[PDB]
Amino acid sequence: MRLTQGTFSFLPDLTDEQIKKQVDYAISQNWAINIEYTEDPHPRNNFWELWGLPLFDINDAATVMYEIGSCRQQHSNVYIKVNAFDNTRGVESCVLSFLINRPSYEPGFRLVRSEDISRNQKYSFHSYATDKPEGSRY
Amino acid sequence: NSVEERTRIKNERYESGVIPYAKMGYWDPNYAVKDTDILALFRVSPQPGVDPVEASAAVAGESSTATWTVVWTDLLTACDLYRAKAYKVESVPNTSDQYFAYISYDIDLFEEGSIANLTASIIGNVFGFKAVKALRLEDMRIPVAYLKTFQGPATGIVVERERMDKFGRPFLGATVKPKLGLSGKNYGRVVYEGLRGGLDFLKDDENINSQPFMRWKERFLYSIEAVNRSIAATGEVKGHYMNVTAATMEEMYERAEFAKQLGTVIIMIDLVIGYTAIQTMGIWARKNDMILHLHRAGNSTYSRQKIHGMNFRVICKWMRMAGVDHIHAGTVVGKLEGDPLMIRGFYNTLLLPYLEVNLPQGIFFQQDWASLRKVTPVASGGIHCGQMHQLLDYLGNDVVLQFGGGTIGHPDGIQAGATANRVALESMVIARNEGRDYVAEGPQILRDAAKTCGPLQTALDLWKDITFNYTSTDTADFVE
Amino acid sequence: NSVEERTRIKNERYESGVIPYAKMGYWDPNYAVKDTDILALFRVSPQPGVDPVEASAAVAGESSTATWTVVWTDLLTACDLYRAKAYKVESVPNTSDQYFAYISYDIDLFEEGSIANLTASIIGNVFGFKAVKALRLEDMRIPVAYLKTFQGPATGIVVERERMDKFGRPFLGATVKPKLGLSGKNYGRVVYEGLRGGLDFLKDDENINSQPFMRWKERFLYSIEAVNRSIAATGEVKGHYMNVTAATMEEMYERAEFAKQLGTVIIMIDLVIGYTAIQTMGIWARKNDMILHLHRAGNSTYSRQKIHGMNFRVICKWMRMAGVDHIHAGTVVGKLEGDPLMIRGFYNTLLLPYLEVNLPQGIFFQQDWASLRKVTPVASGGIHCGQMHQLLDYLGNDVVLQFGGGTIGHPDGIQAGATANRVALESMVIARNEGRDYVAEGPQILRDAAKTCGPLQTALDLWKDITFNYTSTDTADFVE
Amino acid sequence: SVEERTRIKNERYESGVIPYAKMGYWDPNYAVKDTDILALFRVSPQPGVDPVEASAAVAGESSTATWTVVWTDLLTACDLYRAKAYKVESVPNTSDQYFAYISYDIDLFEEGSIANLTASIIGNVFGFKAVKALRLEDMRIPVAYLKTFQGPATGIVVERERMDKFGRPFLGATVKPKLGLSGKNYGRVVYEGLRGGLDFLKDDENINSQPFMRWKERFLYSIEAVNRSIAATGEVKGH
Amino acid sequence: SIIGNVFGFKAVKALRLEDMRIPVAYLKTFQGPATGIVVERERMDKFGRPFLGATVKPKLGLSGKNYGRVVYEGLRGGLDFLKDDENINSQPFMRWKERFLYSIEAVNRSIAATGEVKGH
Amino acid sequence: YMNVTAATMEEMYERAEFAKQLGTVIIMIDLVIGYTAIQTMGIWARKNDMILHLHRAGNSTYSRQKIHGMNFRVICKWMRMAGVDHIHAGTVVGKLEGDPLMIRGFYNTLLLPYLEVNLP
């Protein structure tokens, strides 16, 4: 399956040129940019791993593209995403998040159901990738 | 002859009898507005022979402390303070006998945190006064000190995006159709197909509560199954607006608690439940980590006609204060009324932390929102993916675009309809972000994406020339 | 090319695309109305170029099962049954492009006992449709089978008169003034003086809830002291409408329970709390042997203009169903809008067990009330005892005549004002009962009573020439 | 390493200690807003500590600062949330003692919470080594923040109405001895005091429930005494 | 009794309470610590060393989500605990429930990452 | 079908709630509990997403004799109104009374949305 988290995941995997244009957009809005990665694709895995610190007050897209390449050398077998953050009062949140790397094969999720009171059930999303330990998932 | 006759008030102002409202203290063109005052702007149409200042002073009086004849009991109170003041009366541009009346009300007139009390004064009786043949409330300045007595949105758009893990684009949704008649299991089918095909949300129709053709509990149960199926299928957080609208507060609570127990991220309510049930739900939603969608059912009964009623921007203010997380706010290009500049005013009222006066958008008061959370506007009704460029331009990035007929009417099925909308959205967002003139190029941007998306090709072929071009009823009085 | 393309519906009605609402099943001039159907009459003003039947069919469709494009999911339901039908479309007399549209809705479309659900369908979205530039809901036929799912008035006028031990005359009342600013102890003073002087009731103003100048508990406490003082002074049952209107249901309940604990015969609520809180209070009032007065705050925002909104007679029906015991319904001769024939329709809708069609009164449907209890109409706002003959004639015997300014504005004090009103009322009632032409003789009947009632003499001298003569906005389309 | 390469080189958000007065907490040109909470502190700096740095330390450590620079500031609207010491003055007739005026944005505080207000204003700053003494003298609580609090349950106006006593002070008395009296003896003292002319008497602050007298009998005897005194005088009385 | 009024007496220009002897018979009327250090170490399975912790910074202004991030990074990096700042309760910039929800996610992420009991 | 039939309403509720807690799709009640307990259970079953089976215990005391009592079709109407989801209605060929045409009437009364007069 295709993991459709991220702003552009119904479009094909973005080229480096497409990614650079999104980085240029973020820079033009004075947003901070960071890079994160994970091998737990759970929809509520809120804290993907940090690739260094966020880049604040960025003038040059090439600095971001360099770190994207550097992160890919270590983690191109798993998920990598680019986030943009706006610290304007009343936002103070992520304002853009898109996937830049995916595993070659994502097996996706088992929907787990348990019987509960009357007709109610409890549900869990089990990642098939997480059947194996970190480092052996993808 | 008696002690009552002997102690009668001889003072001209407080002797018995009728005197004009404009001579009772309710007209003061030199009044210095305080930053704690509640201000209201009324569009006033006096009857023939009624003076514009007197009509304005009557509205001020009968929405604050006055009645029709003088009362001595005024003197038991700090009446100079409690009287509302019409302080500016202006001719409306391009009209013969229509006026803008600006009225100031002291903060102490109002119950803290109560939309019912605010509205009891501002709209309680004055719209039925014989002496004005029409009256419309256009805007209000809610001071920071009064705003701080209200919760504001339970969730707000910032926390909503965090719960959904969805940033940098509009949300997508769809109302399930037909409006009435579907069973619980069929409802769940539609929800599963729509979410699994690409929509972030679906929703109950406003009139889907609990009925002979479908009782509410099975709908909620099948709906959460559909939601969780779609989450497992996609890896996205998804939601369905379970409608908890009901006859009594106890029934609404029973439905909201059940939805909570099932683990829905989101519920909905209808404006027809009324302000007190809405405030009660706003508080419940904050307490229970729930996104609270407000459908504006019945709003157009008073909001449509320019000369009389309440402009929707005022309702936006009251519902933001009350604690809803979404409100329907127009599409411009769909089947329901929506002048683009009026809509811009509505969306800004819901989303901005601060508004400057902007007469072309119908924003008459500077409005500080006191850091109350932001309401997500909802664009819904008669829209389709062929308009995506227009929707992104008129309505912006912070909105739920809801495509009911525009998803479920797709000839290749509900999943195809959802996929068309999702691809159309992302294609338009990426083009906007790249700096492209996406309004001029929009039709071509959609055609290009359609080259590798059959569902979108089909949707464009079916609906691309569907338009809803009619003259607006609700329009500005000023232009840029 | 795929299985989705292969299984597309070829049927002309259910193939994808937009077709007129009048060809989707929502226009049927041969439809046979069932006695279980909910009927609605709309005044429809189409945009230029829109066909009157198509506009009417759009209203029917978008208030029942339709959306803007065809959906296959119709076929999962008994859609022929669930579609509403515009069944009669007529020109409104003396208009160029305005129509009466009669629309039928199956009983199964609606949640039992829910005003929120009924209104979600009938008024939810259709007033904002681009294609109609104006729309007004004029009347509804609520079938007996649906009425039986509602409580009706908690108390009703029959039980109310029994609790008060007051028969054969209107009740009297008065709103305390000034509207805002009085303390709890001063409120109690006014209530004591008014009741002790002859009034049956006094009331909180609609905007008197709980505020910096007076918190609610002291008002209720002083008010019940005033009431019980007045009962001991007169030997009559007396009451004060303690306003329990509040921001949340929990606060309203806290206030209603406290009023109950003090032993009030009566409380009040404002229409701005909204339908669900009102229904909740209607049930509470039945459970707790309480008269429930509804003030109609905000009603004139949608009820004033003939071309758009909701006629008040429909609100009368919904609030009678919801369980209120009083509702404000007009004076004719006072400061608020009130055509005499429209008012006659309102009062009859509230009080009669059965209504026949009466076009001059705006009663478009035969209405069986299914033995639901009767709502006491309330005549209030800008009236005085010099009009007593006109009030008894226009408004009849079953009403609360409320004189706020007309009591408290009396130069010799609040007791004198109350006494004037009470003597004026009884003098007029006895004259009517004796067979006298009390409308022609009314001014002389009042003068005769004034010969032995100083307070009445003074009130007549002060106010006898005060009139509120203005052209009505809300008027009939037919005459006798 | 990625961590090395992404280190912040910007002087202000580079790692390390900088004075609070250079972190944004000292601003003598700050425009005070009508929504700001203001505090006045009497600041006695340690020998060698400059009065402005001490006042900025108080401002910083009662708002958003810590002792070293943190990059996580940049995730927030930090310029708004930092409190500003906006005026420092020497105190008349003292050496080494200063008045520091400090402004705090209304968004720093939990609506209606004295615990939260005090947690910021007085939480930690009185124990800072760099000040040998510190006193909170006054605060400006803005109307917008005041409206989130109830204020007095009754208030003197309603109190006088309940007691039916206008135009003079109230009278009262604490029952004595402070401790040791029984419930019944408490009631005796209450009755005699109210009946002789006092509007009120009161339990002593340390009279709660103890081996010499449990609380319920005290309340029961006290209300008997009160109602005896009301019947004896025709006045509303209380204990 | 001990501190109610005596610190304001005109006749003493200053007064400081230095110590108290609380007798065993009075102490037995109090619960004492809910948990205590011994049971605490047993719950945490951490013996023979000090605990480590950290207050999240900046003191005020962070969102619930960003709070969780700091908590996750600190615990996963080696700390036994982190904590809300004393003045972090519920405020316009972050309401309390999202903070607790993100914090327990962060804690449980860190437990799974390390095999240690952790807390916030 | 877990039978929650009991002496008092409180005991019946205890048994129905426990059945609900265990996750049964279905419970039963006996007609001998009587109309008010049955209506109470019918409402409970709607509130708690439970199939409610009615055993017609005691029905034949008044339904058997043609000249006196109540025909079972009337009981079908009242129990359908009351909120039960199943009711025993006959086999024709089994060990209990059941004329085929009477049984058709019973079944139609329970199942149809509308019945026309059908004297046989």
Ligand SMILES: O=C(O)[C@@](O)(COP(=O)(O)O)[C@H](O)[C@H](O)COP(=O)(O)O
């Ligand atoms: O009932 C309907 O018509 C809708 O479900 C839309 O269906 P479609 O998506 O099929 O048109 C919405 O409730 C309206 O958009 C409300 O109008 P507004 O947003 O103006 O309040």
Ligand SMILES: O=C(O)[C@@](O)(COP(=O)(O)O)[C@H](O)[C@H](O)COP(=O)(O)O
């Ligand atoms: O606020 C007022 O104006 C009143 O208290 C009347 O005061 P007076 O008796 O002093 O006029 C009533 O609420 C109005 O009559 C309501 O209008 P309606 O009955 O039309 O809803």
Ligand SMILES: [Mg+2]
């Ligand atoms: Mg809808």
Ligand SMILES: [Mg+2]
């Ligand atoms: Mg009033």
Ligand SMILES: [Mg+2]
């Ligand atoms: Mg003491």
Ligand SMILES: [Mg+2]
């Ligand atoms: Mg701390």
